[PDB]
């Protein structure tokens, strides 16, 4: 087929078959891409290989057109000619092709490995059509890296609520959470097919897993769970729409007598109503999801699609929407696979509803009035382009916080990524400044929020709350078990249980730690509700049990530290094992 | 691409290349046109340029035909023969062509720049196909003169309805009114894109250019404005459909007991029935635009299209039809763009109603049974050609007077155009005399007729009124300020403001001034409805406040003055500037 070259936007029919994505390149650009890197195979409407019954020379420089086909230098017909010549590669639209000298940057994108953080920062400063390409090939590379994971199958049939794993020998083990699912396959004699998705969590002790089946046809031992890497569709729409300020608000008809609670941001509601897309930088727990609720109320005769990256963000937003917005004109869309049970108090899958809450991956093709995308630091440019492709609306509002943890970003191991390169929106917030800023927190007490203000902001955090004398940071050396792919501090849980007897406050508490293995084992010896820092960042609670396992760069992340300390409202039993990580906060020594 | 020669209607395939309209030309006529003037480029089915690899010879006297292409003298193959030879430029249908002698007139029409006085008298006494071609090339010249105006650029945005503009250096400023629409741009790096169709008006205080816009975009500093130019559509229909005196009335059925008001007009109705097109000439306010409604009420089965070149002439017709005709079976046509507001009481934009009303440029292609073209003095041969191309009908009635003010003819600066050159129909009324004539002023008080039957119409008017004692004309010099090209006179607005607190009944009067800008600027001091003399032609008012702005050739034009003062139904105040004209009328002194 024919299309448009990525780095010059000229009509072509050539595409480097050595890239994982096969991007369209014109004559000159493809010539420059094959002459430079190790990319050699080129696909036209037919592939550029030696099309003799016996040969395999799959480069383009060595290849000669003869008759109606292509041959190597050993089998070529006496009549000419090489494709890769005249400064070009023989393809379509040769006279009207106009190249560009970006092929060094394009080669650097196509040659990278996503191990350095230099690849990620180069994959964010390029032009828009290369930003899409980098996001697409990065998603593909991470999906290939996920695919090569060791299989599991049940030992034998045990129970409805507790099975037991058996892995392939000596392979990497997937992180066990609600993000990761398996599929059971049925190759029994007889037609390998999916028996259903399985969601796995760690159980009480040993090699035990609490399991959730999607299709409940109970399995035997021959049906096996695999990580099932799934297809990634291409993307077309830009990461952001082009901005266009308006003199006055178009089509958004404001109402009167809104409320006195969120009347303090009607100026920022209007400033949203003016421009095309808006950027709200909310400090941790400053009414950011509250802002979008008040926005939906200020222009209530409009249509809003709330969109979130992770399920937890739209879960918190659905709770707040039930609280303030009228439930009757509001639908929460759940994907049909039903892998994770969403917050269902709205009508499920009413896409024509006035206000629709959804994850970014399962968005229906709709036109809206203003679409509010939520928690942008979780999202990568793939997500922003997906929401721009599926959802067309008169206004776009991106709310989030650079001071949170980014996308999980598994491929990156050497170097650490600044928030500036998390995605395009977080680049733009850090570049010109955010459109809107919220300024008075309502979760932390004053001392802890002042610790936040001195840490990552320019002394701009304050909170309308006073301390409960229940902000702890224990002194334990933190013996790490490490009998697992992650790190576990079960003696830190021993420290927690040998304390907290004289402090009975945090007994409905949520357990927080940067290591999900400690979260997994924590819910077993004691009946504690636990959720890691990944399942944090959207979940606000009053009583908190935090543990810091090691003293290293994993626990030294300042954004993860900020989002960890900003979680607790009235009572925090926290263990900080690092002296420096106890030195920068004013907490009780005991 | 064959066609018909303009000046002998032979078949042909050539087109002169230097003429703006590319008139088709037969072979002998094309030789006569390219051997006398400097129009040496000719296009056949392909152009007559030299098909060398690189050569620039276009002069048809030089080229040769060889093989299947036209080569200059220094690239001809030896099998070749000259085009511009034997007195005939070679084209298709070479030997079936009839020469002509009008190539001493077609050259003057196609060559001149339309600025002198004689070119319009030559564009109106030639043959019919030359009348159409001359009108077409005059329209094209007036369109490409608009490219000579300056280019605007924003300096700052004082307010959302108040821009600030700086014009290009060395190029004349366009006049700022709703005739001339501009297009915006933001061309910096970054979006060389139109950002809306705007139009301007000079705000009263400061150098503020209050802009109206189609869009709702915020304007930056760098946004810059280019005037739009409309392409001239080519025209085909004759200016005057040939007359055929019938024996008896066809297509029209007269009425029993029409009215007591149109009882004296019955003979002219029978004459309109008998002829094909008829022309009516009367001095102002003597029943001309009334006669058209009487034609409506004398042939009630006859579908009628009323047309004029202004919008206030067709609105005066609309008001008269509202008073007399049934309002269910009537209509009114407004164009979609519509920078000016029109009459809105009929079912707008419903051309199927029995009595349609329109401006001549915006007519829809339809039929009729008698079509009434009011105000032929404001019509050019382009307008009569358009009304003959769209509207197909059985009878035509052209109503109007040559002694009112004509189409403006912006290019005309050196000379004066007598009435018999305004178009073809005004020539017919000043060559052989009008078919129907009614002079007796049934509108203006006898003082107005007494002073206007001595200026233009040499003592041929008597009024069906008396001296109504409300005709005041004063002489105040009025020290002028200058706008873009349309002067503005503050102290005469001052004396009018004095004549508004001290005469209470006159607060329904209409302001009449020869300049558009003062007409806009005296609304913000006085608040009266405002009308310019050029666009006031055909609609009457109870009281009229006329203010001669400047002593020039435009505002001291006796036809402009006549159409200014003959619109007052009962009372008029005339703040004069010229001494002799103030002595020419015979009002009260004031």
């Amino acid at each position: 087929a024919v299309g448009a070259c990525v780095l010059c936007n000229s009509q072509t029919s050539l595409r480097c078959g050595a890239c994982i994505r096969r991007p369209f390149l014109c004559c000159k650009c493809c010539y420059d891409h094959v002459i430079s890197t190790s990319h050699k195979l080129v696909l036209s409407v037919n592939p550029y290989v030696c099309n003799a019954p016996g040969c395999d020379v799959t480069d383009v420089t060595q290849l000669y057109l003869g008759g109606m086909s292509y041959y190597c230098k050993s089998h070529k017909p006496p009549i000419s000619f090489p494709l890769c010549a005249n400064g070009q590669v023989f393809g379509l639209y040769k006279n009207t092709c106009v190249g560009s000298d970006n092929v060094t940057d394009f080669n650097a994108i196509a040659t990278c490995d996503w191990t350095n953080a230099g690849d990620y920062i180069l994959a964010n400063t390029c032009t828009e059509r290369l930003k899409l390409f980098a996001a697409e090939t990065l998603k593909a590379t991470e999906e290939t890296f996920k695919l090569s994971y060791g299989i599991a199958t049940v030992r034998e049939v045990l129970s409805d609520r507790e099975l037991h794993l058996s892995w392939e020998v000596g392979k990497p083990r997937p992180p066990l959470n609600r993000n990761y699912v398996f599929t059971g396959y049925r190759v029994t004699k007889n037609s390998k097919v999916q028996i259903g998705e399985y969601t796995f969590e760690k159980g009480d002790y040993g090699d035990a897993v609490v399991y959730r089946g999607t299709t409940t046809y109970k399995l035997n031992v021959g049906d096996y769970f695999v990580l099932t890497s799934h297809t990634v569709m291409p993307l077309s729409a830009p990461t952001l729409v082009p901005q266009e300020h308006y003199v006055r608000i178009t089509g958004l008809y404001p109402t009167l007598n809104i409320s006195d609670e969120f009347s303090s941001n009607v100026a920022n509601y209007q400033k949203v109503g003016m421009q095309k897309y808006s950027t709200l930088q909310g400090p941790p727990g400053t009414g950011k999801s509250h802002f979008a609720i008040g926005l939906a109320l200020y222009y209530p005769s409009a249509r809003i699609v709330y969109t979130a990256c992770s399920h937890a963000a739209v879960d918190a937003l659905c709770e707040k929407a039930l609280k303030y917005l009228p439930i009757d004109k509001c639908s929460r869309i759940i994907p049909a696979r039903a892998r994770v049970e969403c917050f269902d108090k709205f009508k499920v899958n009413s896409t024509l509803e006035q206000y629709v809450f959804c994850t970014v991956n399962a968005l229906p093709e709709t036109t809206a009035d203003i679409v509010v995308f939520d928690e942008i630091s979780m999202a990568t440019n793939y997500d922003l382009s997906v929401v721009n492709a599926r959802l067309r609306a008169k206004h776009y509002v991106y709310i989030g916080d650079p001071a949170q943890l980014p996308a999980p970003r598994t491929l990156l191991t050497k170097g650490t990524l600044e928030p500036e390169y998390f995605n395009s929106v977080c680049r733009l917030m850090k570049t010109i400044g955010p459109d809107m800023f919220l300024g008075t927190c309502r979760r932390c007490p004053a001392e802890i929020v002042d610790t936040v203000s001195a840490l990552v902001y320019d002394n701009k955090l304050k909170a309308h709350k006073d301390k409960s004398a229940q902000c702890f940071k224990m002194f334990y050396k933190g013996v790490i078990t490490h009998d697992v792919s992650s790190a576990i501090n079960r003696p830190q849980i021993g420290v927690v249980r040998e304390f907290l007897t004289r402090n009975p406050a945090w007994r409905k508490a949520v357990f927080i730690s940067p290591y999900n293995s400690q979260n997994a084992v924590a819910s077993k010896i004691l009946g504690l509700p636990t959720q890691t820092v990944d399942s944090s960042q959207g979940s606000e609670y009053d009583y908190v049990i935090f543990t810091q396992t090691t003293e290293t760069a994993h626990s030294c992340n300042v954004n993860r530290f900020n989002v960890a300390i900003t979680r607790a409202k009235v009572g925090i039993l926290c263990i900080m094992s690092d002296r420096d990580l106890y030195d920068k906060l004013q907490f009780t020594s005991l | 691409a064959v066609g018909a020669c303009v000046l002998c209607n032979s078949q042909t395939s050539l087109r002169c290349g230097a003429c703006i309209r590319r008139p088709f030309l037969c072979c002998k006529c094309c030789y006569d046109h390219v051997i006398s003037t400097s129009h040496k480029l000719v296009l056949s089915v392909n152009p007559y340029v030299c098909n060398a690899p690189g050569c620039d010879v276009t002069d048809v006297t030089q080229l040769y035909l060889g093989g299947m292409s036209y080569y200059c003298k220094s690239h001809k193959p030896p099998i070749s023969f000259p085009l511009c030879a034997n007195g005939q430029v070679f084209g298709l249908y070479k030997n079936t062509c009839v020469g002509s002698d009008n190539v001493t007139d077609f050259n003057a029409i196609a060559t001149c720049d339309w600025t002198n006085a004689g070119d319009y008298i030559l564009a109106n006494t030639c043959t019919e196909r030359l009348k159409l071609f001359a009108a077409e090339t005059l329209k094209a010249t007036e369109e490409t003169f608009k490219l000579s105006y300056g280019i605007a650029t924003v300096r700052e945005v004082l307010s959302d309805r108040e821009l600030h503009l700086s014009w290009e250096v060395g190029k004349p400023r366009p006049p700022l009114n709703r005739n001339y629409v501009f297009t915006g741009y933001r061309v910096t790096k970054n979006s060389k894109v139109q950002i809306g169709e705007y139009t301007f008006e000079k705000g009263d205080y400061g150098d503020a250019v209050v802009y109206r816009g189609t869009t709702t975009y915020k304007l930056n500093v760098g946004d810059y404005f280019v005037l739009t130019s409309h392409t001239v559509m080519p025209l085909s229909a004759p200016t005057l459909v040939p007359q055929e005196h019938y024996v008896r009335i066809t297509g029209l059925y007269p009425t029993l007991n029409i009215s007591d008001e149109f009882s004296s007009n019955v003979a002219n109705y029978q004459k309109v029935g008998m002829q094909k097109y008829s022309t009516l000439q009367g001095p102002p306010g003597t029943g001309k635009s009334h006669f058209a409604i009487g034609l409506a009420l004398y042939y009630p089965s006859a579908r009628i299209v009323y047309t004029a070149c202004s919008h206030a002439a067709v609105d005066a017709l609309c008001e008269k039809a509202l008073k007399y005709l049934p309002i269910d079976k009537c209509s009114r046509i407004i164009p979609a763009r519509a920078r000016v507001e029109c009459f809105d009481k009929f079912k707008v934009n419903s051309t199927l109603e029995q009595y349609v009303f329109c401006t001549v440029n915006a007519l829809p292609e339809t039929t009729a049974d008698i079509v009434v073209f009011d105000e032929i003095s404001m019509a050019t041969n382009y307008d009569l050609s358009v009304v003959n191309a769209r509207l197909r009908a059985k009878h035509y009635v052209y109503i109007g007077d040559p002694a009112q003010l004509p189409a403006p003819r912006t290019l005309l600066t050196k000379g004066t155009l007598e009435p018999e050159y305004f178009n073809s129909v005004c020539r017919l009324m000043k060559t052989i005399g009008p078919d129907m004539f009614l002079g007796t002023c049934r509108r203006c008080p006898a003082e107005i007729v007494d002073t206007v039957s001595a200026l233009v119409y040499d003592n041929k008017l008597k009024a069906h009124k008396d001296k109504s004692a409300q005709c005041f004309k004063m002489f105040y010099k009025g020290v002028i300020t200058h706008d873009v090209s349309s002067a503005i006179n503050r102290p005469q607005i001052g004396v009018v403001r004095e004549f508004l607190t001290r005469n209470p009944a006159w607060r329904k009067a209409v302001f009449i001034s020869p300049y558009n800008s003062q007409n806009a600027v005296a609304s913000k001091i006085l608040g009266l409805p405002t009308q310019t003399v050029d666009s006031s032609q055909g609609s009457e008012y109870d009281y009229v406040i006329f203010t001669q702005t400047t002593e020039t050739a435009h505002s001291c034009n006796v036809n402009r003055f006549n159409v200014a003062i003959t619109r007052a139904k009962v009372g008029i105040l005339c703040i004069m500037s010229d001494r002799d004209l103030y002595d020419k009328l015979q009002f009260t002194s004031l």
């Binding site: - | 298709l92 249908y93 070479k94 030997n95 079936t96």
Partner: protein, 396 residues
């Protein structure tokens, strides 16, 4: 698998002599593709065999009509020509005879297809052709049966049906004769063996099938083009009742087609030097050509003038653009020159003079539009009669 298929009914826009509308069933490409692959080898080996009964693919030009008419008369003893006419051939044709036609066109697949493959191809023909869903102006109706005129095998399935009705007429005519009156002791024994092989055997008797087919070719020679048949039957036999005359076809079409074939549409030509009275809408006459006598086909003159005067597109009215249209019409109307009615023989010279006038005014206009006539111009032979007479001489 069975693929049912919707077939449109298109209204035909072509010149005709009677005012009933004519419709053609446009069959879906999902059916036409597969039926082409299934039947194309046989259907292109019927059109490439000369001298057989099914004369599809034998041209009437270059002495083809003479050769068709000479292989009909393949030594029948006292020939009479006979021609019949199925009324409503494509609508009255029962489902059983269409299934028989599709089972005879699929006997060639003894090796390439299995048995169930041939059954599912039969079911696909009966679902896409025989009793399909006809779409007739925005509405799906059920077509009850009988062939649809647009599938991949319609002239040939029609030819099989036509041969089947002629053989059934001969079987009925031979059995229904008395039997004591049959004087020829060979033929009476053939009637006896024929009844026994019909109603007293369950296995096909290839000896007698060959012998009866030899009898039919010896005394009932046929020539078949999809339903136009010319038969050259022995006349002494058909008078004695041992071979089908017309009345046997009237009976067979009564009980096996449910139509009554009126004898005012079936001709009988007792004199062989006039040829078939009408076959494929061309009459036949015996002319002298070269040195010997040949048969030539001539059309109906009203047809050729009606194709001149009434054209089905506005641009075909121009004439000068369409000289190939009049060359083709004169090629078709050439043999009218040898017809003895003079007003018939003027149709050819009308077309020749019209081609000459058309070309004269064509070069007139193409000399006006330019000033050079065409340098090479070989239209000068389309108005000589030798270019047309070369189309009916047997050299090529």
């Amino acid at each position: 698998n069975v693929i049912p298929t919707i077939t449109q009914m298109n209204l035909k826009y072509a010149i005709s002599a009677k005012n009933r509308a004519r419709t053609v069933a446009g069959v879906s490409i999902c059916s036409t593709m597969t039926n082409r692959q299934f039947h194309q080898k046989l259907l292109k080996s019927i059109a490439a065999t000369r001298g057989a009964t099914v004369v599809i693919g034998t041209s009437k030009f270059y002495g083809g009509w003479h050769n068709m008419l000479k292989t009909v008369y393949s030594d029948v003893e006292n020939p009479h020509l006979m021609g019949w006419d199925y009324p409503k051939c494509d609508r009255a044709m029962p489902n059983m005879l269409r299934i028989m036609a599709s089972l005879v066109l699929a006997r060639k697949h003894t090796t390439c297809c299995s048995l169930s493959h041939r059954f599912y191809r039969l079911a696909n023909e009966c679902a896409q052709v025989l009793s399909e869903m006809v779409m007739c102006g925005g509405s799906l109706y059920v077509k009850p049966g009988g062939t649809s005129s647009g599938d991949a095998t319609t002239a040939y399935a029609n030819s099989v049906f036509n041969i089947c009705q002629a053989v059934t007429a001969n079987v009925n005519a031979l059995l229904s004769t008395d039997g004591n009156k049959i004087a020829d002791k060979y033929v009476r024994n053939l009637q006896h063996r024929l009844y026994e092989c019909l109603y007293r055997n369950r296995d096909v008797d290839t000896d007698f099938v060959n012998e009866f087919y030899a009898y039919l070719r010896k005394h009932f020679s046929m020539m078949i083009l999809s339903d136009d048949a010319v038969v050259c039957f022995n006349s002494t036999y058909a008078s004695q009742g041992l071979v089908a005359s017309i009345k046997n076809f009237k009976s067979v079409l009564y009980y096996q087609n449910n139509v009554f074939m009126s004898e005012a549409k079936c001709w009988t030509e007792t004199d062989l030097t006039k040829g078939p009275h009408e076959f494929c809408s061309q009459h036949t006459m015996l002319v002298k050509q070269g040195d010997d006598y040949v048969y030539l086909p001539y059309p109906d003159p009203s047809r050729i003038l009606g194709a001149g005067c009434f054209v089905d597109d506005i641009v075909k009215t121009d004439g000068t653009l369409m000289i190939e249209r009049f060359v083709s019409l004169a090629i078709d109307a050439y043999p009218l020159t040898k017809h003895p009615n003079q007003e018939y023989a003027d149709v050819f010279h009308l077309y020749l003079q019209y081609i000459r006038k058309l070309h004269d005014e064509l070069t007139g206009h193409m000399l006006d539009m330019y000033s050079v006539m065409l340098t090479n111009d070989n239209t000068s032979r389309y108005w000589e009669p030798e270019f047309y007479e070369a189309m009916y001489t047997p050299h090529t």
